[PDB]
């Protein structure tokens, strides 16, 4: 029950293949709710979530305007960056911009973060006090200077602490049907013999939301326990996430292997044993 | 909602 509103902007140059590609996506919690993409038929901010479907054209116009603004400035910003790093016009390069507000369980504002990256590396990073930057670089130090003068108006603090929070609280009330619904994982164990000496136990969590889960394996006995293979959480492609953990156990010993699952959709942690 | 930049780099 620790909630977020976060935006992810990507800009990528294409020397003599048009002007730079620009893409924006917004997230409440682990649900994407909006896209903008300056190529695709309509160069407009669009809903990616059934609950955004009944905001009127006021909302979309503002967000479309905000996007073209960010796009067109990032086209400029790439040329600047190309300048400070002295890189040719033929090279493609990448500017990324990310920010979010985080609430606690109680709806108390917890943290703001905003951050820029050039060609993969950290470029310019907003500080704790939300009114001052750290630049990784000699070149970034130029951009540090320019972003302090203008953000003496505390534009980030204003957004992150206030506008970002207010709108989080708004998106939560609109989506609640789907978003504040805790979907506990459908959980089962699978057995995959290797030799007569050993099988693999695989503990599955399937079709759960939010995406914060813990899959741990433990063994009753004093015996050794081979390293668990945890696969990284992965989208079903329908809102929900999947995860699994796997051990190889000596054949015979499979009923001493208990798999615990922690998730907020679960009243209390479930424990799960293979049963053929 | 997002926000457009006010400065540049």
């Amino acid at each position: 029950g620790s909630h977020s509103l976060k935006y992810f902007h990507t800009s990528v140059s294409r020397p003599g293949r048009g002007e730079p590609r620009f893409i924006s996506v917004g997230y409440v919690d682990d649900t994407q709710f909006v896209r903008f993409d300056n190529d695709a038929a309509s160069p407009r901010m669009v809903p990616r979530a059934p609950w955004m479907e009944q905001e009127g054209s006021e909302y979309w116009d503002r967000e479309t305007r905000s996007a073209r603004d960010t796009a067109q400035i990032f086209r400029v910003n790439l040329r600047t960056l190309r300048g400070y790093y002295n890189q040719s016009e033929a090279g493609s390069h990448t500017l990324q911009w990310m920010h979010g507000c985080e609430l606690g369980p109680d709806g108390r504002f917890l943290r703001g973060y905003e951050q820029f990256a050039y060609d993969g590396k950290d470029y310019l990073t907003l500080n704790e006090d939300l009114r001052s930057w750290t630049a990784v670089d000699t070149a970034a130090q130029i951009s540090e200077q320019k972003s302090n003068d203008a953000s003496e108006a505390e534009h980030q603090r204003a957004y992150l602490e206030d506008t970002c929070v207010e709108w989080l609280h708004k998106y939560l009330e609109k989506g609640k049907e789907t978003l504040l619904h805790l979907e506990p994982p459908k959980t089962h164990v699978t057995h995959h013999p290797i030799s007569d000496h050993e099988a693999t136990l695989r503990c599955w969590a399937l079709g759960f939301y939010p995406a914060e889960i813990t899959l741990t394996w433990q063994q009753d006995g004093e015996g050794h326990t081979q390293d668990t293979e945890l696969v990284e959480t992965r989208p079903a492609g329908d809102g929900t996430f999947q995860k699994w953990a796997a051990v190889v156990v000596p054949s015979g010993e499979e009923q001493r292997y208990t798999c615990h699952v922690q998730h907020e959709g679960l009243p209390e942690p479930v424990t799960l044993r293979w049963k053929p | 909602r997002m926000y457009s930049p006010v400065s540049i780099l």
Partner: T-cell receptor
Amino acid sequence: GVSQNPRHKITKRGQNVTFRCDPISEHNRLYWYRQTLGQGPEFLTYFQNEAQLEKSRLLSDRFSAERPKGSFSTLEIQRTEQGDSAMYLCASSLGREYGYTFGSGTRLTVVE
Amino acid sequence: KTTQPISMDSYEGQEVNITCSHNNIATNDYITWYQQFPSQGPRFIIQGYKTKVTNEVASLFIPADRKSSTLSLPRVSLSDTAVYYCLVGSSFNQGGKLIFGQGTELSVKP
């Protein structure tokens, strides 16, 4: 800077006029303001590229802006009146704030 | 929305203090001042939120109450003789759609 064509216009009452603005290149926003004597500029309209966004509540449908190609813009006043006689200021920016620059203006006098 | 002085009277080499009046200013609205020389279009000089600011051109002071701020011109010249307008708002809702008052006609005499 912002450049305005022409710097001076006279026009007989009841007749049309068309000023033009050529913004700082790379500025994606262009705004039209109207300034009479001893008064701050009133906002008339603006554009993101060629898209004419918000258009003032108090604006005559005589007044009407165009920015085809999202570069230069032309303000057009139809069937001119006395009150119309005022400085028409143009402005260009890079998004909501940066590089906000005003042109020098086009002075309009409507003679009876 | 904000009132200032319709005009103000100065002598060369002095320091001049125009004060904007914004009692109902929003919590995140900031204060940004333009300078329009006779004939030419208005020019940005200084913007401030709550911290005092200081550029070549001038300095802006804001008190806690934040109900009024005060642009301060150093060693004022004959050239520095313009209308000085005070805008109160935010790009974020404004859209770069500036709202000007009457401003304050500054005279400088020798």
